Symmetry: C3
Subunit: 320 residues, 3 copies
């Protein structure tokens, strides 16, 4: 596959991690993701340097991940800290590869490329996920399609182009009938404007803005929800979906939490998950013939994000 490795991707949501490691594949790389007894998240290559057993099937022993096959022990940095055989010796060849991980904005970000180039300044800005003004709920979903098809889906219903960031803004005075959603509709009564924005950040992290407000008031003074919609490639033809909603209205609604923690309700439904997986199963045919997609007006935002990913995939491929 052709992946963009020198970039931050979400590998998990913080609640998924524990002292029991989680095995998850990121850009065709099996990682063992666990949280150390002092709370710091580690990401080790899920292939023991000895005879390749899966570290993610082990447990922590004195805060060290102990391989379930023969008991080599590893720290968050990948250094072998205990060898229970023979002279107990730990040459450098017993170290497992370690990945940069930064926990920020209720997200576990990982750098799968050159670990020396990992720069926390490049992590996309998702502060609303930790903002006490917002109520943030969400979850995880696995999808059997290449990540770019869900990037299209999400970049879909003014387009500003920046460096490693793209914005697709739509302001809707009144709409086709009423430009009010059921959750927004109960807020006020006087005539309203609505917004439907989404921001794309380098590789495949996205944040939308769904808003309704009386008359023509500050966009930020509206009743709104910011959607976390982040994709991380799993294999060339599969990916992980991290979705979440940060709402500023009816914050302490235990009922609203239920519908928004649903897979079909916050991200793509059953017919919407079926569309991307179904498109993916049609890839071999469209490629075998000369079948290229037919663009419409509503595709400008998606096409520009697609071209940014294409540039990045070619630029890294040029390196190797």
């Amino acid at each position: 596959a052709t992946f963009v490795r020198n970039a931050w991707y979400v590998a998990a949501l913080p609640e998924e991690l524990s002292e029991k490691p989680l095995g998850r594949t990121i850009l065709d790389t099996p990682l063992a993701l666990y949280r150390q007894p002092d709370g710091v998240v580690a990401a080790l290559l899920d292939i023991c340097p000895h005879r390749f057993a899966p570290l993610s099937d082990g447990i922590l022993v004195n805060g060290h991940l102990q391989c379930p096959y023969h008991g080599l022990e590893f720290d968050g940095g990948g250094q072998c800290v205990h060898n229970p055989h023979g002279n107990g010796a730990r040459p450098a060849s017993l170290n497992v590869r370690s990945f940069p991980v930064v926990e920020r904005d209720a997200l576990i970000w990982i750098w799968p490329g050159d670990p020396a180039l990992a720069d926390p300044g490049a992590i996309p800005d998702f502060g609303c996920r930790v903002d006490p003004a917002y109520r943030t709920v969400g979850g995880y979903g696995h999808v059997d399609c290449n990540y770019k098809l869900l990037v299209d889906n999400l970049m879909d219903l003014e387009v500003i182009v920046g460096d490693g960031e793209i914005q697709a803004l739509m302001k809707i005075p009144g709409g086709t009938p009423s430009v009010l959603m059921a959750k927004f509709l109960r807020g006020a009564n006087t005539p309203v404007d609505a917004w439907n924005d989404i921001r794309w950040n380098k590789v495949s992290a996205m944040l939308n803005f769904i808003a309704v407000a009386p008359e023509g008031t500050p966009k930020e003074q509206s009743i709104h929800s910011r959607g976390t919609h982040i994709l991380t490639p799993e294999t060339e033809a599969s990916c992980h979906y991290f979705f979440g909603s940060s709402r500023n209205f009816g914050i302490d609604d235990p009922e609203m939490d239920g519908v928004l923690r649903s897979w079909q309700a916050q991200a793509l439904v059953k017919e919407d998950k079926v569309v991307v997986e179904a498109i993916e199963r049609r890839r071999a045919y469209v490629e075998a013939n000369g079948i290229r997609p037919a663009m419409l007006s509503c595709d400008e935002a998606a096409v520009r994000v697609s071209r940014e990913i294409e540039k990045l995939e070619q630029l890294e491929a040029a390196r190797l």
Copy 2:
């Protein structure tokens, strides 16, 4: 893959189609087969020209199939007839391929190859399925084997279906049509078939004929008659046995029975609608599906089949099919 695309194939039975589209793959081509408001059947490539969503998961909107992804609308010809986006424009690139589809003899025929060569006069004659002189029942079956294995099985020496237990032989070969004939005067095993025997009582003649038409469409003739009565004035059933490749290693089987006996017998309809009784026994599906899993081994070693006496008709259908494979492989 290796298919003979310039030929007519059955893609569905009429009763499978309605205004809710059916997704079916024919010779590695995903089709959406649906019936328009006036009942006329359309056959579109199941890949929307926009972002490749499956049209078969859509519905009709004012009689037009609307893609469930972004709402483009198509007519029976694949023409884009509504664009709900932007200036609404409908350039030619928003057309989806349409395949020649002809509903005839209670079968839904499709031409999966070069549409310029699709000639409805070439569709094999399965008239007995609409002949009010006959009672016609049948159904559908899917099998995990290359279709030629089920064509071999059906062209096999005096081999009938389970519900059909019991001059001599003759194989006539023509252009894209083969007939393998058997007349059994009086017999030695049995001349009355279990389902037939309730016709008359005195000693009889028996027939077991089968017709093959270009690429995998077959119609057999299982017959019983007293003494020496006209072959066509006999008690008989015309069996519809049509195979359509799905993938290189799987296929669709459309089986049917056109009988002139027990026309108003619903008990008889039940068994003849049975896929193991009429088309393929469970032990035969296991053999053919098992042979398919052996294809990689026999090809990797040099293993060619050793033919017997009971194989004359099938080997000829096999060689006719192969020539057609060559005609297409040469063109491109």
Copy 3:
């Protein structure tokens, strides 16, 4: 795939075979295994010479395997003995390949390569399996890993490694010990201070026989209370294999309760937690091969490394011939 075809491998346990044929694949070769009316075991290529049907889905007709498609009949040599078609003629083109098979030591051995080199004298010695002095129990397992990984797993006086011709032995005596020399099942023999042994023998390609022993003080190794475990692997595909496991013990011969706990034989030929490691190692093969990733060997690996490289040398010899 790269297999060692000029070698004996177990294809089954005798109780798996009967007059009902068994389909099993050995080194990418589909076999039909059945036992003839006189008890003699035959091994035919599971591909009928007519139209490639599974012979293994057939039945015996007068001791001859009858193909379930069209009824051809085969004897133990693969010879077609009945053709129910036409003039009944049976040209040689209707014979199916037959494989050398030798039933020995309650094992079904097969030579999947060149039949001209098949020498029953090269079958490894597993006599304890038929020794009336021993009580033998075991079974079968299929595992989704290349067989070398379960040879690695199993190859893992103090610890001494003996190397012979097509034979490697890894011996361990634990004199008295410091952790424990008493095993849970063994402890109910003697009680005053004890020695323990854990040896394992590997014979060419992938047949292994271990020795688990416990005995008081310093008594003869052959006079200990012990079990000789059968651990034989046979490749199925590039990435799957058959596991034949067994226990031949000299203690509690007539104990049917004892038969039960050793038939929970996850303990010697680890097959539940141990199936999980090798299948997981196998699923990582594409990554470790795609990068230049080689295993880092330790002190506990001398036996495994020598057996692995002998398996490797034999693979090259055959790839070299062709």
